[PDB]
Design a protein around this ligand. Structure first.
Ligand SMILES: COC1=C(OC)C(=O)C(C/C=C(\C)CC/C=C(\C)CC/C=C(\C)CC/C=C(/C)CC/C=C(\C)CC/C=C(\C)CC/C=C(\C)CC/C=C(/C)CCC=C(C)C)=C(C)C1=O
Ligand SMILES: CCCCCCCCCCCCCCCCCC(=O)OC[C@H](COP(=O)([O-])OCC[N+](C)(C)C)OC(=O)CCCCCCCCCCCCCCCCC
Ligand SMILES: CCCCCCCCCCCCCCCCCC(=O)OC[C@H](COP(=O)(O)OCCN)OC(=O)CCCCCCCCCCCCCCCCC
Ligand SMILES: CCCCCCCCCCCCCCCCCC(=O)OC[C@H](COP(=O)(O)OCCN)OC(=O)CCCCCCCCCCCCCCCCC
Ligand SMILES: NC(=O)C1=CN([C@@H]2O[C@H](COP(=O)(O)OP(=O)(O)OC[C@H]3O[C@@H](n4cnc5c(N)ncnc54)[C@H](OP(=O)(O)O)[C@@H]3O)[C@@H](O)[C@H]2O)C=CC1
Ligand SMILES: COC1=C(OC)C(=O)C(CC=C(C)C)=C(C)C1=O
Ligand code: SF4
Ligand code: SF4
Lengths: 198, 317, 178, 157, 339, 92, 43, 385
């Protein structure tokens, strides 16, 4: 069983309250995991304001953006859950600010607050389809130039719909609808028995 | 008989060209903890002939956008000038001794810069043109100090004929005197053969320019040219600055020592290549125009003064 | 604990002696000559290369190499088609379908490892209860055609028979560890 | 021996030996298999010994070793570089990522094999196909190049 | 048979196992392409070294294309190739009578033995390809010999389809490249100054698709289809048009054929694939026959494709950097001749 | 003639290779810096010329004038270089 | 019982710091060599 | 501006890179790197794979630092399971983690030189690298792509001869760093090619999320190995090699020092490795031993379920960052109660670094860009994921 120090779960908890108090217009929920990690949750409109306070506040300097990601809970009305993980080299602590964005309700861009996000925001658009206003140059980064569809969405087939082969007749690479020679065997793995109350 | 001699100079040199390649692929190897090519033939002796045959057999590719002459003239010119410059070299006796011999070598070298210019324009692809323009510049720049360094030498030799230096260097190498220029002749010889420390003409990491569109037979001819040059320039160092002992009674100890010094200085640019990273394009010209040209022009004047006030004006003829 | 690399502790004021030493460093390329000495030194060291066909680079017993299906000494193939080798394969490489053999025993009618799909993780070696599927030592099985790389039960069983002696020695050496 | 057949068998044996002895490979450098060859170029298993060029531009390359996954964004390029290589040319597919899709077979961004994009001559198996294993594969290409009889076919054609 | 399952693309099954003896050819390449695309089992008998048939491997899927070593003189090789095929397609042909193979062999002798065995095997259908306008009396030995074959094979294999294509238009074809390559020649000889030899080209693919469709259709038995084209042409416009897209000067100068047959004889003497053939020459000035016959394209399911449409791709390699970017629209079209 | 004999063999050897090589097998890149260099190059190349006769001129009876002349030429060009350095020239 | 472990008493000590040797001829002495060559060579 | 792309086949492009360069003459005014040429779908495939069968994927994201990568997934999954690896395993992960940083740095320093034009340093060190892989192969069976570091503990005990052989390699390795040290650290040609190139200011480095040797090279003092000690990095003593100015030289010098500091950490690990078990003793998380599963029913049931279904980690989400040789490598693993993950965002030290190329390569020549990519130690597996 991992060793857990409650010093952190107390320090981080307090900070959470501090952030919440300072930014009550946007903070909806602020929780600390059992793993000693804080996760302020903000209304999408608070993207710019909450980050800026953390990047430039003496009692909470969160200078670098570790990551910007978007889990996709299809059930959730607001499908995407943009999560921004930040690090404070001054206070040696990380916080995560997570917002919610639906497919056609764009989030603001923080390239202003952290220029690290210039690329990750393009990554989130390419994979999940969330759009970021005021982004300097939003354009697909990881997917092919002509790719249609946002791949990491839970509703996108793994194999996808198009695959490439070289055709002599046309002497050029050519998409064709995917035809797989051994479909992905979809093993069902969930057991019908729960583990604990959680 | 003259043809026999023509054959004796060209054929051996060409064969030497080939084996330099092998030697470059073993001395670089042992320096890098690897045997190098020994499996084809005995100790890799057949290795140079093997890829020559592979290169000529592979299809020569004429890019859709390419001149068909400034493309085939360029390797022919490169091999022709390099093999030609071996015509007037004292070993100790020259095949065609020319009274203005060093001016022949300087002029013939200068003409090779075109082949680079012509090949770069002929390819009609961006990598080739960018590479050629920088390349011509490197070669030309390293000609201006290259020429002045020779003029300093000549003034202490008395003539342009390479044959005179065998009589100038009967007591001491011209390295002792004029060593400061030897170094500057050696570095310039490294630039003009586009060898490593100065291989930006065709940087590989930078523009994988000269042979970008050149494969098979054209690749080979320049290729051959470069390596023959690699030898020729080293050989000119071994006549102008390191003067091999000359005995009129037995002419071959001159050629025997010419053989030894040329191989060692040819070995040196092989050793330089593995040992040093390549210089930046401007770092290369920064050296010649800033570091070397002021040294050369001033030491050029010292070599017009050393003769006069040391009452040592060299004997013409 | 930190350490400054490339931080000049102080400003040594030029002393002629110092200046000369430096100027000589630029003028007579002293450090460049230092670098040449290092490469000349190795030229004299013994090269580390091995004659590849004649000598082989050493691989110890756990090397995963090429898949094989083992058999009991009696001659009964070890696999009993529990099919969890299929379950834990990360790449979906192993395809197994089974039916009760005439003897009444459980056996796999078809066992197909797609080696091009396989990423040689070695979990199948791990997962098998009877340890029927093993990572065999051979790494040299390059093939002219893509189809040859797909392997059915007969190729793997044959691979197993050919390399059984070494596979047994390798498993013998490493089983205490597992 | 004396027969137009014997002269045409011996001379290809010569032509085949030249191509076999000097194969200048060109590695695209996809994924990680490129490392497992950078180890072949390195001192334990020198490739140059065998007559293999560590770095060769496409136009001067006899063999293309596709190491690593060929995504659907690099496919259109591989074909270009294969198409721009000089005619005598051979392809060695290294890695279960390239010969077949390997882990990442079912991905939407990975071509399931380079055989779909470029004709492949030798398939070298293994997630990081060992470096001897690539060296065995390159040696197998040399066995394939020895067997080819182009001059014989032209004579009896 | 093989029930056809799948969605229609590679890695799917169509149930056509087909020996195709001359696949390495320009037409062939295309035949294997569609057959492979459809998912058919294709057995490709080959004689040239493996290096040359690599271009066929990526076509078709794994275990869908099988290559067999085969020699025309050796009857046994043809025997095993058709052992397990149910469709045999014959594209064996050449323009230059080679030292060890005569026009008879490449057109009539060999293509007989092949279908002969195919029957012994029990192949459902055999498709034999012979050149268009092939009289048993036509001037070119080639055309006449081909005619001789289409007859024979009918006795070895009754109800064997006989598609009879015109000279073919396609990248890597001769009809279009040959003329375009006259550039090397300063002057481009044209018998009758390229007149009175109206010609109707047909895109290679159209031909291929047609051929493939034959394999999978009961309507074609004993049928002698004629894939022709979407528009005819006097050789003059064709030649100039070509030179037009190639953007190279066109200098039509008439040359008496009697002398020209001699020029064909000259290159014909060439050891390495004569570029022009006495038998070619005649063929080139052999007027295209009229279209009254079992229709081919369209009839077999593919609408012909006009020459001008794809000409740009076939003739592009012959242009110079200056014209490379130039497009079809910039250039003019040639004129047809219902005559 | 002796040279002519050698040279034509030299071209022949190269033309032979390329011929077999082709027979056996059977837009706005401009930087004033680059132009500027070429120019400087000739200004220096011309000077090389005015400096080339120096081996014959060493034996000139004058001597004083020889050196006085040669030193002036080398110095004035070097100053040209000096101003090239001082100006952005030679600074690519 | 038998598991792969550090030898009793621990292993010996390993060097990690740069051991580049500052070995060379002193600059003044160096200049003299080349200068002497020129001085003599000229004579 | 003469747009020219640094196409993939070029050697300096790491196999897959299409840097659209705008050449204002030879000086390059803008770079627009087009990555995506090696996006394999690593993070959409993991959602369909159980936690153990997704470990292998983490050895292929940065393919030059395999085990340190699989120490980030192993720490994450372990956090979400509130389980800790046994003491011997943690030392083994630190032992293998520093062998990987020596392995990555030999990769980064020597290949950078290969790009600049120095060819011999690569050959001398690459022989020292196969000596090292052998250690991977002798402990896991794979030269690279081992799968040795498992989500709970490590997979198998070290063979009985490995620690002696690691001592002999570490004993003589420093001379090998010393040797390229002499050949490529004072060469005026290297210094000129590397010094004062791609300077990045301290605040700009934090803002661009550089987080690596790029962070330390400009003088910011941040090492996740001392600041947030993961595994046992609290019981080993080392000095972070902070550079002063930020030129590509100071960053090289830092990478050469970290190789030396890692030899100091490897020494401590061999000197102080505890007797014990290599994997946690909870059969629910780590698979039962071969003898036990073949003699005890509770063990066969636990082996069958673990291999076929999985750990079934409790629902939660964590971002765990370890100091991978390139920089901070972090996995944001979101977990439902299921045995297979829901999301796994691999933070790649490299997605941030490549973004910095346009800012860092400012007022620089075509040749400088080759050095700029070299000093970011970018492997496109991590960036493309
Ligand atoms: C990227 O392009 C390439 C280069 O340029 C940088 C290479 O240098 C290289 C490396 C090549 C080498 C060092 C080996 C090549 C060596 C040769 C062609 C020399 C072989 C010798 C001959 C031509 C025979 C000698 C002369 C004759 C023709 C007949 C003798 C009378 C490669 C592989 C390459 O692809
Ligand atoms: C037998 C093979 C001998 C090889 C010698 C070179 C490799 C070994 C080097 C060992 C080493 O590390 O010491 C270098 C040493 C290392 O010194 P350092 O760079 O560490 O510092 C010493 C110099 N100070 C302190 C002043 C900075 O370099 C030198 O000693 C100076 C070398 C000057 C070289 C000048 C250019 C070369 C000579 C040109 C004139 C012509 C000479 C003769 C040419 C050939 C004639 C036939
Ligand atoms: C390929 C292009 C480059 C060709 C190679 C370079 C050749 C350079 C020749 C430079 C001049 C040589 C020379 O001046 O020697 C003259 C020679 C002896 O004259 P001299 O030195 O004064 O001695 C007299 C008392 N002994 O006696 C002579 O008079 C020689 C007369 C000239 C000999 C030239 C030999 C042929 C070279 C031209 C070939 C032309 C065909 C190729 C054209 C290429 C065009 C790009
Ligand atoms: C009265 C005279 C008193 C003494 C005068 C000494 C004169 C020395 C002659 C050469 C001068 C070269 C020089 O001054 O250095 C230029 C360059 C190093 O200069 P750098 O550090 O760039 O300085 C920057 C300032 N702008 O130098 C270089 O870049 C050198 C690069 C060399 C790359 C290859 C080096 C090979 C070294 C080994 C071979 C040396 C030659 C030996 C053989 C000579 C012939 C036998
Ligand atoms: N313009 C055209 O192309 C037209 C063609 N046709 C007919 O269509 C058919 C295909 O034409 P096309 O593809 O251009 O012909 P090709 O010249 O491309 O050759 C077709 C195939 O026949 C094989 N072949 C030729 N001679 C022999 C032989 N003696 N033994 C074994 N195989 C042989 C060749 O194999 P290999 O190269 O390996 O020897 C080649 O793969 C021809 O038979 C022709 O009569 C009809 C009208 C127009
Ligand atoms: C070390 O970084 C990298 C290289 O540059 C030195 C590459 O060359 C390549 C690919 C290079 C070739 C052509 C083998 C890769 C994959 C790489 O990771
Ligand atoms: S696990 Fe071992 S036994 Fe069970 S099926 Fe796979 S191979 Fe046969
Ligand atoms: S095959 Fe295994 S190793 Fe080669 S690339 Fe695909 S994953 Fe990396």
């Amino acid at each position: 069983v991992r060793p857990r120090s409650d010093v952190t779960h107390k320090q981080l908890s307090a900070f959470g309250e501090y952030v919440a108090e300072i930014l009550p217009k946007y903070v909806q929920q602020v929780q600390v995991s059992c793993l000693d990690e804080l996760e302020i949750c903000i209304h999408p409109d608070g993207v710019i304001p909450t980050l800026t306070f953390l990047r430039d506040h003496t009692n909470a300097q969160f200078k670098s953006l570790a990551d910007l990601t978007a889990v996709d809970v299809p059930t959730r009305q607001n499908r995407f859950e943009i999560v921004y993980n930040l690090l404070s080299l001054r206070f040696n602590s990380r916080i995560r600010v997570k917002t919610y964005a639906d497919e056609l309700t764009p989030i603001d861009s923080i390239v202003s607050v952290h220029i690290a996000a210039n690329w990750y925001e393009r990554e989130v658009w390419d994979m999940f389809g969330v759009f970021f206003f005021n982004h300097p140059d939003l354009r697909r980064i990881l997917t092919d130039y002509g790719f249609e569809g946002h791949p990491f969405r839970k509703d996108f087939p793994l194999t996808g719909y198009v695959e490439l082969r070289y055709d002599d007749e046309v002497k050029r690479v050519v998409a064709e609808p995917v035809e797989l020679a051994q479909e992905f065997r979809k093993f069902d793995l969930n057991s019908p028995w729960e583990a604990f109350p959680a | 008989m003259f043809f026999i001699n023509i054959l004796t100079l060209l054929v051996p040199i060409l064969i030497a060209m080939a084996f330099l390649t092998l030697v470059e692929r073993k001395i670089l190897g042992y320096m890098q903890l690897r045997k190098g090519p020994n499996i084809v033939g005995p100790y890799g002796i057949l290795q140079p002939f093997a890829d020559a045959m592979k290169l000529f057999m592979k299809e020569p590719m004429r890019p859709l956008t390419t001149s068909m002459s400034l493309f085939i003239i360029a390797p022919t010119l490169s091999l022709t000038l390099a093999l030609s410059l071996w015509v007037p070299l004292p070993m100790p006796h020259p095949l065609i001794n020319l009274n203005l011999g060093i001016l022949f070598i300087l002029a013939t070298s200068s003409l090779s810069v075109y082949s680079i210019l012509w090949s770069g324009w002929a390819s009609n692809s961006k990598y080739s043109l960018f590479g050629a323009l920088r390349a011509v510049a490197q070669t030309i720049s390293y000609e201006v100090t290259m020429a002045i360094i020779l003029l300093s030498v000549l003034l202490m030799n008395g003539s342009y004929s390479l044959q005179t230096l065998i009589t100038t260097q009967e007591h001491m190498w011209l390295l002792l005197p004029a060593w400061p220029m030897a170094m500057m002749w050696f570095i310039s010889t490294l630039a003009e053969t586009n060898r490593a420390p100065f291989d930006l003409t065709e940087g590989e990491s930078e523009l994988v320019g000269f042979n970008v569109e050149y494969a098979a037979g054209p690749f080979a001819l320049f290729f051959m040219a470069e390596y023959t040059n690699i030898i020729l320039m080293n050989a000119l160092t071994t006549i102008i600055f390191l003067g091999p002992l000359y005995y009129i009674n037995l002419p071959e100890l001159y050629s025997t020592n010419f053989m030894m010094e040329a191989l060692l200085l040819s070995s040196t640019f092989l050793w330089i290549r593995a040992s040093y990273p390549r210089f930046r394009y401007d770092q290369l010209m920064h050296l010649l125009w800033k570091n070397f040209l002021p040294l050369t022009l001033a030491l050029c004047m010292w070599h017009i003064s050393l003769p006069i006030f040391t009452a040592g004006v060299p004997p013409y003829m | 604990t930190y350490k400054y690399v490339n931080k000049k502790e102080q400003e040594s004021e030029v002393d002629m002696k110092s200046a000369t030493d430096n100027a000589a460093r630029i003028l007579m390329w002293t450090e460049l000559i230092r670098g040449l000495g290092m490469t000349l030194s190795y030229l004299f060291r013994e090269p580390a290369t091995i004659n590849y066909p004649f000598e082989k680079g050493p691989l110890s017993p756990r090397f995963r190499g090429e898949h094989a299906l083992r058999r009991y000494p009696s001659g009964e193939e070890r696999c009993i088609a529990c099919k969890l080798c299929e379950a834990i394969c990360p790449a979906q490489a192993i395809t197994i379908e089974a039916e009760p053999r005439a003897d009444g025993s459980r056996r796999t009618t078809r066992y197909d490892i797609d080696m091009t799909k396989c990423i040689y993780c070695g979990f199948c070696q791990e997962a098998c209860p009877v340890d029927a599927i093993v990572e065999g030592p051979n790494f040299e099985f390059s093939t002219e055609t893509h189809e040859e790389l797909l392997y059915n039960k007969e190729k793997l069983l044959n691979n197993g028979d050919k390399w059984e002696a070494e596979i047994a020695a390798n498993i013998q050496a490493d089983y205490l560890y597992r | 021996r004396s027969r137009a057949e014997y002269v045409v068998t011996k001379l290809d044996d010569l032509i085949n030996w030249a191509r076999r002895s000097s194969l200048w490979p060109m590695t695209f450098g996809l994924a990680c298999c490129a490392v497992e060859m950078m180890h072949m170029a390195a001192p334990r298993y020198d490739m140059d010994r065998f007559g293999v060029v560590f770095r060769a531009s496409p136009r001067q390359a006899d063999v293309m070793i596709v190491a690593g996954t060929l995504t659907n964004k690099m496919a259109p390029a591989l074909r270009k570089v294969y198409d721009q290589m000089p005619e005598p040319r051979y392809v060695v597919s290294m890695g279960s990522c390239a010969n077949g899709g390997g882990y990442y077979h079912y991905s939407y961004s990975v071509v399931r094999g380079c055989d779909r994009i470029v004709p492949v001559d030798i398939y070298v198996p293994g997630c990081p196909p060992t470096a001897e294993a690539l060296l065995y594969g390159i040696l197998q290409l040399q066995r394939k190049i020895k067997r080819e009889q182009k001059l014989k076919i032209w004579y009896r054609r | 048979a093989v029930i056809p399952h799948g969605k229609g693309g590679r890695s799917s099954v169509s149930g056509v196992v087909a020996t195709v003896f001359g696949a390495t050819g320009f037409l062939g390449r295309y035949v294997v392409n569609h057959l492979g695309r459809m998912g058919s089992q294709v057995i490709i008998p080959y004689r040239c070294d493996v290096y040359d048939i690599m271009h066929l491997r990526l076509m078709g899927d794994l275990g869908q294309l099988t290559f067999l070593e085969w020699d025309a003189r050796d009857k046994d090789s043809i025997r095993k190739a058709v052992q397990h095929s149910n469709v045999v397609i014959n594209l064996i042909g050449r323009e230059w009578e080679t030292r060890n193979f005569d026009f008879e062999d490449v057109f009539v002798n060999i293509p007989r033995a092949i279908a002969q065995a195919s029957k012994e095997a029990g192949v459902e259908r055999f498709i034999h390809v012979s050149h268009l306008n092939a009289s048993m009396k036509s001037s070119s030995k080639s055309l006449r010999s081909k005619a001789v074959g289409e007859k024979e094979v009918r006795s070895v294999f009754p109800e064997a389809i006989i598609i009879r294509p015109s000279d073919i238009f396609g990248r890597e074809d001769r009809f279009l490249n040959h003329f375009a390559n006259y550039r090397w020649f300063l002057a481009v000889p044209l018998v009758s100054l390229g007149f009175k030899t109206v010609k109707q080209p047909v895109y290679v693919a159209d031909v291929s698709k047609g051929i493939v469709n034959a394999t999978k259709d009961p309507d074609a038995v004993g049928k002698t289809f004629a894939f022709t084209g979407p528009n005819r042409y006097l050789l003059f416009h064709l030649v100039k048009y070509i030179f037009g897209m190639t953007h190279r000067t066109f200098i039509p100068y008439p040359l008496p054929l009697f002398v020209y047959s001699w020029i064909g004889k000259l290159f014909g003497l060439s050891p390495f694939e004569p570029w022009t053939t006495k038998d070619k020459v005649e063929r080139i000035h052999i007027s295209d026959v009229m279209p009254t016959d079992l229709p081919g394209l369209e009839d077999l399911g593919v609408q012909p494709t006009p020459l001008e449409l794809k000409s740009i791709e076939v003739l592009r390699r012959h242009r110079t950097y200056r014209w490379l970017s130039s497009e079809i629209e910039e250039t003019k079209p040639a004129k047809t001749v219902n005559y | 003639m002796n040279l002519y004999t050698v040279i034509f063999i030299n071209i022949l050897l190269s033309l032979t290779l390329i011929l077999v090589a082709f027979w056996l097998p059977q837009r706005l890149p401009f930087s004033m810096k680059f132009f500027l260099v070429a120019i400087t190059f000739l200004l220096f190349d011309l000077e090389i010329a005015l400096l080339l006769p120096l081996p014959w001129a060493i034996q000139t009876i004058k001597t004083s004038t020889m050196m006085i002349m040669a030193f002036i030429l080398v110095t004035i060009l070097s100053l040209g270089l000096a101003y090239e350095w001082t100006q952005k020239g030679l600074e690519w | 019982v038998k598991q792969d472990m550090p030898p009793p008493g621990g292993y010996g000590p390993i060097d990690y710091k740069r051991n580049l040797p500052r070995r060379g001829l002193s600059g003044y002495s160096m200049f003299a060599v080349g200068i002497g060559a020129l001085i003599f060579g000229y004579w | 501006n003469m747009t020219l792309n640094f196409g993939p086949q070029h050697p300096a492009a790491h196999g897959v890179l299409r840097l659209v360069l705008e050449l204002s003459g030879e000086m390059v005014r803008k770079c627009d790197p087009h990555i995506g040429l090696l996006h394999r779908g690593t993070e959409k495939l993991i959602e369909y794979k159980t936690y153990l069968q997704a470990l292998p994927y983490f050895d292929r994201l940065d393919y030059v630092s395999m085990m340190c990568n699989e120490q980030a997934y192993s720490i994450a999954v372990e956090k979400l399971l509130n389980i800790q690896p046994p003491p011997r395993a943690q030392w083994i992960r630190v032992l293998f983690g520093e062998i990987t940083r020596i392995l990555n740095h030999i990769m980064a320093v020597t290949t950078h030189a290969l790009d600049i034009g120095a060819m011999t340093p690569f050959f001398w060190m690459f022989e020292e690298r196969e000596k090292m892989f052998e250690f991977y192969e002798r402990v896991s069976g794979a030269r690279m792509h081992a799968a040795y570091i498992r989500p709970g503990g490590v997979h198998q005990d070290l063979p009985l001869g490995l620690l002696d052989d690691i001592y002999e390699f570490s004993k003589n390795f420093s001379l090998r760093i010393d040797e390229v040290e002499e050949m490529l650290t004072n060469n005026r040609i290297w210094r000129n090619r590397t010094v004062d190139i791609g300077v990045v200011t301290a605040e700009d480095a934090l803002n661009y999320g550089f987080s690596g040797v790029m962070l330390r090279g400009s003088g910011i003092q941040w090492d996740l190995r001392k600041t947030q000690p993961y595994d046992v990095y609290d019981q080993v003593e080392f000095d972070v090699p902070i550079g002063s100015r930020g030129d590509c030289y100071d960053r090289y010098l830092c990478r050469v020092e970290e190789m030396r500091q890692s030899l100091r950490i490897i020494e401590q690990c061999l000197n102080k490795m505890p007797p014990g078990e290599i994997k946690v003793d909870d059969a629910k998380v780590s698979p039962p031993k071969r003898a036990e599963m073949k003699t005890s029913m509770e063990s066969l049931i636990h082996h069958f379920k673990l291999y076929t279904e999985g750990y079934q980690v409790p629902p939660g989400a964590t971002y765990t960052a370890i100091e991978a040789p390139k920089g901070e490598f972090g996995v944001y693993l979101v977990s439902d109660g299921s045995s297979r993950p829901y999301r796994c965002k691999i933070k790649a030290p490299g997605f941030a670094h490549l973004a910095g190329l346009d800012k860092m390569s400012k007022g620089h020549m075509l040749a400088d860009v080759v050095a700029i990519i070299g000093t970011q130690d970018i492997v496109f597996g991590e960036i493309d994921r």
